[PDB]
């Protein structure tokens, strides 16, 4: 919305795509973090 | 480059020399607002023309207007960015062949996806006028007598009521066309212009911004 | 040795469950109204799709 109302410039489904492939860019940087911590040093349960 | 290639070689670079104006040139191209100016012979395009001739460009992004007889010619065209429609609601007889211009302009399916940029002009003559005698709406357009100046269409402080009652009844003479349309694809905006007003110009570049946000709205499906 | 934990029977673990499940109808309920008046300008506003 910001770029919208900042594109005074005439002339700037594949922006929704787009949308979705930023959202899982971040939500990705995660997703490889949570998965080395998964597969390197699982977390357990502790009595 | 190697330069390997004779006379073609010589091609290859004209070629190259040639695409990079076109690039340079395309620059300037994509951030124009063309617009074009279908004001009547006596609405007044020439007020505005002069304020042009005056100094148009604002800021650093460029505009280019074309002004212009039937219209072969104006279905040409869907590339330029909004309608400049002058009017002089100063001649109340005037006035109704330029709102069955409007007509014509705003239900031009061509141009459908067009905005246009109304301006009601030489309104200051318009109070002089109506401040006298002598013009009576009522004989032209009668429905004046049964109109009622709007609270919410904001008046300006230090003017005559009756003043108001007719300015605001060309104004909603000609917003019937755009609001009976509501299409969306295209919104008309009306602005009262005046003889030796540098301000006018401002206006149209505002204008200009907004359309194309709303442009960017659709694109992305907010609006 | 008492075994101790949060549990589902614990009578916390109730309201903890009643909240979370709350909190589930009442996202089930926004998008459902966000379905039903989808075109609405107000919802098409808000990038619908995000």
Known sequence: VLLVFEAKIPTSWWGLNL??????????????????????????SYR | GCTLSAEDKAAV?????????????????????????????NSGKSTIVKQ???????????????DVERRKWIQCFNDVTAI???????????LQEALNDF???????????????????????LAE?????????????????????????????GEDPRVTRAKYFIRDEFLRISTASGDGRHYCYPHFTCAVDTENARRIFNDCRDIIQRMHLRQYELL | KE???????????????????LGIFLTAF?????????NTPIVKATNREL
């Not at chain 1, 899982?24 to 998964?38: E, G, K, P, R, S």
């Not at chain 2, 004209?14 to 012979?41: C, F, N, P, W």
């Not at chain 2, 007509?103 to 003559?125: A, E, P």
Request: hydrophobic residues 45%; contains cysteine; positive net charge.
């Open chain 1, 19 to 44: 949308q979705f492939l930023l959202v899982f860019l971040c939500t990705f940087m995660q997703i490889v973090i949570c998965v080395i911590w998964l597969y390197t040093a699982p977390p357990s």
């Open chain 2, 84 to 94: 400049i429609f002058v009017v002089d609601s100063s001649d109340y007889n005037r």
């Open chain 2, 52 to 66: 042009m001739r005056i100094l148009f460009q604002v800021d650093k992004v460029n505009f280019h207007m074309f």
């Open chain 2, 129 to 157: 006028k109506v401040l006298a005698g002598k013009s009576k709406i009522e004989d032209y357009f009668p429905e004046f007598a049964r109109y009622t100046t709007p609270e919410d269409a904001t008046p300006e402080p």
């Open chain 3, 30 to 38: 926004v998008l459902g109204v966000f379905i039903k008046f989808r």
């Open chain 2, 13 to 41: 670079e004209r070629s190259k020399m040639i695409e990079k104006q076109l690039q340079k040139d395309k620059q300037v191209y994509r951030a124009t607002h063309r617009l074009l100016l279908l004001g009547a012979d």
């Open chain 3, 3 to 21: 075994i101790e934990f949060l549990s589902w029977t614990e009578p916390f673990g109730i309201a903890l469950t009643l909240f979370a499940v």
């Open chain 2, 103 to 125: 007509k014509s302009i705003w239900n031009n399916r061509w141009l459908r996806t067009i905005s246009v940029i109304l301006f009601l002009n030489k309104q200051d003559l």
